[PDB]
Scaffold this active site. Sequence first.
Site, PDB file in Angstrom:
ATOM      1  N   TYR A 161     -17.918  20.637 -25.732  1.00 32.66           N
ATOM      2  CA  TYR A 161     -18.283  20.334 -24.211  1.00 32.66           C
ATOM      3  C   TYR A 161     -17.839  21.459 -23.268  1.00 32.66           C
ATOM      4  O   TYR A 161     -16.549  22.021 -23.366  1.00 32.66           O
ATOM      5  CB  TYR A 161     -17.856  19.126 -23.637  1.00 32.66           C
ATOM      6  CG  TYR A 161     -19.103  18.023 -23.747  1.00 32.66           C
ATOM      7  CD1 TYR A 161     -19.478  17.439 -25.231  1.00 32.66           C
ATOM      8  CD2 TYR A 161     -20.124  18.195 -23.046  1.00 32.66           C
ATOM      9  CE1 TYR A 161     -20.832  17.144 -25.213  1.00 32.66           C
ATOM     10  CE2 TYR A 161     -21.557  18.106 -23.179  1.00 32.66           C
ATOM     11  CZ  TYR A 161     -21.785  17.448 -24.449  1.00 32.66           C
ATOM     12  OH  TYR A 161     -23.066  16.814 -24.792  1.00 32.66           O
ATOM     13  N   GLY A 197     -23.247   3.569 -29.316  1.00 35.99           N
ATOM     14  CA  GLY A 197     -22.371   4.489 -29.099  1.00 35.99           C
ATOM     15  C   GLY A 197     -20.766   4.189 -29.677  1.00 35.99           C
ATOM     16  O   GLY A 197     -20.330   4.941 -30.576  1.00 35.99           O
ATOM     17  N   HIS A 237     -26.116   8.763 -33.154  1.00 35.31           N
ATOM     18  CA  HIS A 237     -24.928   9.110 -32.563  1.00 35.31           C
ATOM     19  C   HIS A 237     -23.727   8.345 -33.083  1.00 35.31           C
ATOM     20  O   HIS A 237     -23.181   7.659 -32.809  1.00 35.31           O
ATOM     21  CB  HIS A 237     -24.709   8.816 -31.008  1.00 35.31           C
ATOM     22  CG  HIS A 237     -24.092  10.171 -30.227  1.00 35.31           C
ATOM     23  ND1 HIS A 237     -22.665   9.873 -29.631  1.00 35.31           N
ATOM     24  CD2 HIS A 237     -24.256  11.310 -30.264  1.00 35.31           C
ATOM     25  CE1 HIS A 237     -22.371  11.137 -29.313  1.00 35.31           C
ATOM     26  NE2 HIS A 237     -23.173  12.138 -29.719  1.00 35.31           N
ATOM     27  N   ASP A 238     -23.492   8.669 -34.508  1.00 38.11           N
ATOM     28  CA  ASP A 238     -22.681   8.347 -35.589  1.00 38.11           C
ATOM     29  C   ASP A 238     -23.352   8.968 -36.729  1.00 38.11           C
ATOM     30  O   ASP A 238     -22.424   9.743 -37.256  1.00 38.11           O
ATOM     31  CB  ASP A 238     -23.430   6.723 -35.998  1.00 38.11           C
ATOM     32  CG  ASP A 238     -22.333   5.461 -35.144  1.00 38.11           C
ATOM     33  OD1 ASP A 238     -21.506   5.700 -34.498  1.00 38.11           O
ATOM     34  OD2 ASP A 238     -23.279   4.372 -35.248  1.00 38.11           O
ATOM     35  N   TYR A 286     -24.468  -1.900 -31.583  1.00 35.59           N
ATOM     36  CA  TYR A 286     -23.265  -1.177 -31.509  1.00 35.59           C
ATOM     37  C   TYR A 286     -23.076   0.193 -30.813  1.00 35.59           C
ATOM     38  O   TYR A 286     -22.368   0.881 -30.723  1.00 35.59           O
ATOM     39  CB  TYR A 286     -23.266  -0.672 -33.181  1.00 35.59           C
ATOM     40  CG  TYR A 286     -24.208   0.147 -33.742  1.00 35.59           C
ATOM     41  CD1 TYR A 286     -25.297   0.784 -33.018  1.00 35.59           C
ATOM     42  CD2 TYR A 286     -24.506  -0.463 -35.038  1.00 35.59           C
ATOM     43  CE1 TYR A 286     -26.397   1.312 -34.073  1.00 35.59           C
ATOM     44  CE2 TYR A 286     -25.458   0.459 -35.900  1.00 35.59           C
ATOM     45  CZ  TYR A 286     -26.343   1.010 -35.260  1.00 35.59           C
ATOM     46  OH  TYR A 286     -27.447   1.687 -36.175  1.00 35.59           O
ATOM     47  N   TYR A 301     -23.515  12.583 -35.570  1.00 35.34           N
ATOM     48  CA  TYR A 301     -22.127  12.652 -34.581  1.00 35.34           C
ATOM     49  C   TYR A 301     -20.925  13.126 -35.706  1.00 35.34           C
ATOM     50  O   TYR A 301     -20.176  13.935 -35.515  1.00 35.34           O
ATOM     51  CB  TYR A 301     -21.814  11.395 -33.850  1.00 35.34           C
ATOM     52  CG  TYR A 301     -20.891  11.315 -32.785  1.00 35.34           C
ATOM     53  CD1 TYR A 301     -20.488  12.842 -32.173  1.00 35.34           C
ATOM     54  CD2 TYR A 301     -20.282  10.476 -31.838  1.00 35.34           C
ATOM     55  CE1 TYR A 301     -19.792  13.071 -30.978  1.00 35.34           C
ATOM     56  CE2 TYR A 301     -19.416  10.596 -30.886  1.00 35.34           C
ATOM     57  CZ  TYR A 301     -19.201  11.891 -30.474  1.00 35.34           C
ATOM     58  OH  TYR A 301     -18.786  12.214 -29.123  1.00 35.34           O
ATOM     59  N   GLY A 348     -19.144   0.811 -30.454  1.00 30.80           N
ATOM     60  CA  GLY A 348     -18.410  -0.373 -31.088  1.00 30.80           C
ATOM     61  C   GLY A 348     -18.815  -0.781 -32.395  1.00 30.80           C
ATOM     62  O   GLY A 348     -18.165  -0.420 -33.425  1.00 30.80           O
ATOM     63  N   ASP A 374     -24.668  15.165 -28.898  1.00 34.04           N
ATOM     64  CA  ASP A 374     -23.990  14.488 -27.867  1.00 34.04           C
ATOM     65  C   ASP A 374     -25.243  14.337 -26.649  1.00 34.04           C
ATOM     66  O   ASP A 374     -25.688  13.411 -26.254  1.00 34.04           O
ATOM     67  CB  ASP A 374     -22.880  15.010 -27.131  1.00 34.04           C
ATOM     68  CG  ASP A 374     -21.628  14.769 -28.020  1.00 34.04           C
ATOM     69  OD1 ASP A 374     -20.785  13.613 -27.865  1.00 34.04           O
ATOM     70  OD2 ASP A 374     -21.173  15.640 -28.854  1.00 34.04           O
TER      71      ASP A 374
END
Length: 124
Positions: A73, A30, A48-49, A28, A52, A32, A99
């Site tokens: 950012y 990042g 990163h989920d 998955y 995140y 999907g 990130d």
Amino acid sequence: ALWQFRSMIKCAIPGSHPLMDFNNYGCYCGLGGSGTPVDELDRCCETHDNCYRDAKNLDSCKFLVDNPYTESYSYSCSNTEITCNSKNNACEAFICNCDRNAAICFSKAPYNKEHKNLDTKKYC
Ligand SMILES: [Ca+2]
């Protein structure tokens, strides 16, 4: 932020697509799918989920409805390595730390680019 860490994720991978090398992948990575990963490299996508999201819960950002791909950012790029922001309330800068330490897993990790392209059966 996800599009905004996906300028610098192509600096991180000199490389090509920032995700799609990750979207599908082991399970998955990042983008999907959902469940648990495969690789050391796929573990920084379980987080990163899992680091995140937590802008949604934040000490610095109390509000409900942030969306797990969005906040931060104000970066850079060098050889392949960036920075993150230049301001810092955790609202942006906490998400910005999830990130960039994923740009470090994603440029480098204990990588294997091997279970790309996949599915979730064998894979997840
Ligand atoms: Ca995912």
